[PDB]
Paper text:
We report the first crystal structure of the full catalytic core of WRN helicase in complex with an ADP nucleotide at 2.2-Å resolution, providing a solid basis for structure-based drug design. The overall structure of the WRN catalytic core consists of two RecA-like helicase lobes D1 and D2, each featuring a central six stranded parallel β-sheet flanked on each side by helices and loops. The Zn2+-binding subdomain features a single Zn ion tetrahedrally coordinated by four cysteine residues (C908, C935, C936, and C939) and is closely associated with the D2 domain. The protein was crystallized in the presence of ADP, Mg2+, aluminium chloride, and sodium fluoride, intended to produce the ATP analogue ADP-Aluminium fluoride, although examination of the electron density reveals only density for ADP; similarly, no convincing electron density could be observed for the magnesium ion. Somewhat unexpectedly, the catalytically essential K577 does not form direct hydrogen bonds to the β-phosphate, instead forming polar contacts to motif II (Walker B motif). R857, one of two highly conserved arginines from motif VI, the so-called “arginine finger” shows a dual conformation, in which it makes contacts to both, ribose and phosphates. Using the same analysis on the WRN structure reveals that the positioning of the two RecA domains in WRN is unique, with a significantly more compact arrangement of the two domains, and close contacts formed between motif Ia in D1 and motifs IVa and V in D2. One unique feature of WRN is an additional β-hairpin inserted between the first helix and second strand of the D2 domain. In the WRN helicase core structure, the WH domain is positioned in an opposite orientation and displaced by around 30 Å from the typical WH positioning in RecQ DNA complexes.
Residue numbers in the entry: 528 to 949, 954 to 1072
Write the structure that this text describes.
């Protein structure tokens, strides 16, 4: 067990990064790299705090940290974010002046961003910085690009194996997307890491509700369910990102949203630094409500309170999908992630990959598109399927407290609205709330029959038309009369209802108990649960 940080370390974190404490895995990596000078392979979920692991140590000791990445636009964005935290950083490339390079040699910058190509060609420069200043760490983001079995291989990374040779005292921190053992093996062997610490944060984002819908045929019909008509104009429910597979589909979606006068912006690769800066400005400040994006990184979609992610079209793969939905709910508030898809979507098109020569690669793409289509068509828990892919193992639904609840995914939410089996211990809270309310709404003056007719939307004359205006009228048609009758007998046995006759023995009423009235009081103001021992009559297999 590693030690807690000292006060000087915490003070540095507050002054430069505005955080009052390290996250657990952040400190795992930081202490290992900063104080133990040990190589690291770190797998961090979306929105955990990956960048702090390599930005903080060079700031704390006032030396240089080298960040190797192929995403030039992302390195530009992070440089700006660092300077706005009073941290000097720069992107080093062939196009840079010697004044920037001489300021680097004098130690004016804490964090230096380079591409893999520039790094392979200038190993002598790296050794000079190590002798004169000292390199705290070398970060290799997108480290899965080092070998084939990742979702995106690059050849420029293979020459990073000389870093350990030219700099055997400098620890390397490699960041990758999944906890895949095979990918981690390749990173260690190709980067020449020496017994590195292996850390994984887990991948669950419990505040992200997951849903998958089929496309309806036209864009406006697909998107209008996500809109609210305030006054006499349309609005998104909250800040929204719409991911499109192509620029063409981006323009089509934009053209349709403009029909409703929705405030929208686009986000693509190859945009200028000024364009990305302006999009970030408008999105963060809620001057645009929706960003329609074809990329999943950068300033433009770096926003804390994104409430809704929409994939318009099947996602490319599970890794892209996870990163793309990972942009939502970074403030901890409840967010929703919807995929709108059809079998003809371009990312599910097996027509356009017959012409790839590699044997294992073509089979990988076929299995990925089959895995994607299986997830989209699945009736089981969306969250369990996603967590299984990134843990490289079958995940149990009992591992996290979010699975199986109404805020988990659409397939879990369907089971709470109309239960089914796969001892039966199930949450009948939603159904009990309908029944116990109907008993109290009708005044506890009739038998259980009238509340049942109320819930099933009966046209009977026993029910006064004043009750047909109610919200619950007809919301129980999912269950038969005998089901509601049998469910009421379980509420009598458990002790939430009782049958009672007063002086008039020709009138039997069904009334709430003390426990019944107490439960309904809490359920009026909070979503309450009610666990039961059931029969296959209640939740059939
Ligand atoms: N130690 C910390 N305490 C609290 N919040 C943090 C900490 N480290 C990072 N964060 C926040 O987490 C958010 C996501 O971090 P970031 O590195 O941008 O995620 P990603 O690695 O997915 O891009 C950031 O807005 C950042 O402010
Ligand atoms: Zn230690
Ligand atoms: Zn679920």
């Amino acid at each position: 067990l590693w030690p807690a940080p000292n006060e000087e370390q915490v003070t540095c974190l507050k002054m430069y990064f505005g955080h009052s404490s390290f996250k657990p895995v952040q400190w795992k990596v930081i202490h290992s790299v900063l104080e133990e000078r040990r190589d690291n392979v770190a797998v961090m979920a979306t929105g955990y705090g990956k960048s702090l692991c390599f930005q903080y140590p060079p700031v704390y000791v006032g030396k240089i940290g080298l960040v190797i990445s192929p995403l030039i636009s992302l390195m530009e964005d992070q440089v700006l974010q660092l300077k706005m935290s009073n941290i000097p950083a720069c992107f080093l490339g062939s196009a840079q002046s010697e004044n920037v390079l001489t300021d680097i040699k004098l130690g004016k910058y804490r964090i230096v961003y380079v591409t893999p190509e520039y790094c392979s060609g200038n190993m002598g420069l790296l050794q000079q910085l190590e002798a004169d200043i000292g390199i705290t760490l070398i970060a290799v983001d997108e480290a899965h690009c080092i070998s084939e079995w990742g979702h995106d291989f690059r050849d420029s990374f293979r020459k990073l194996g000389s870093l350990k040779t030219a700099l055997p005292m400098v620890p390397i921190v490699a960041l990758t997307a999944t906890a895949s053992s095979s990918i981690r093996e390749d990173i260690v062997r190709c980067l020449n890491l020496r017994n590195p610490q292996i850390t994984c944060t887990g991948f669950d984002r419990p505040n992200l509700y997951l849903e998958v819908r089929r496309k309806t045929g036209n864009i406006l019909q697909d998107l209008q369910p996500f809109l609210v008509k305030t006054s006499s104009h349309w609005e998104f429910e909250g800040p929204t990102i719409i991911y499109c597979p192509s620029r063409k589909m981006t323009q089509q979606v934009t053209g349709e949203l403009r029909k409703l006068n929705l405030s929208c912006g686009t986000y693509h690769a190859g945009m200028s630094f000024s364009t990305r800066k302006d999009i970030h400005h408008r999105f963060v400040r809620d001057e645009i409500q929706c960003v329609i994006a074809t990329i999943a990184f950068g300033m433009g979609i770096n926003k804390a309170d994104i409430r809704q992610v929409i994939h318009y079209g099947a996602p490319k793969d599970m890794e892209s999908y996870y990163q793309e939905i990972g942009r939502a709910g970074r403030d901890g508030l409840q967010s929703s992630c919807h995929v709108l898809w059809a079998p003809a979507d371009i990312n599910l098109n097996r027509h356009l990959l017959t012409e790839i020569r590699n044997e294992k690669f073509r089979l990988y793409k076929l299995k990925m598109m089959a895995k994607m289509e299986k997830y989209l068509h699945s009736s089981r828990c969306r969250r369990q399927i996603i967590l299984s892919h990134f843990e490289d193992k079958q995940v149990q639904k009992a591992s996290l407290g979010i699975m199986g609840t109404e805020k988990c995914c659409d397939n879990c939410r369907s089971r709470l609205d109309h239960c089914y089996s796969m001892d039966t211990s199930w949450d009948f809270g939603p159904q009990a709330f309908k029944l116990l309310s109907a008993v109290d709404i009708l005044g506890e003056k009739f038998g259980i029959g009238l509340p049942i007719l109320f819930l099933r939307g009966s046209n009977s004359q026993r029910l006064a038309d004043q009750y047909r205006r109610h919200s619950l009228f007809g919301t129980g048609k999912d269950q038969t009369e005998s089901w509601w009758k049998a469910f009421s007998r379980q509420l009598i046995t458990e002790g939430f209802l009782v049958e009672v006759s007063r002086y008039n023995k020709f009138m039997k009423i069904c009334a709430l108990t003390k426990k019944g009235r107490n439960w309904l009081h809490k359920a009026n103001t909070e979503s309450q649960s009610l666990i039961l021992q059931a029969n296959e009559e209640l939740c059939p297999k």
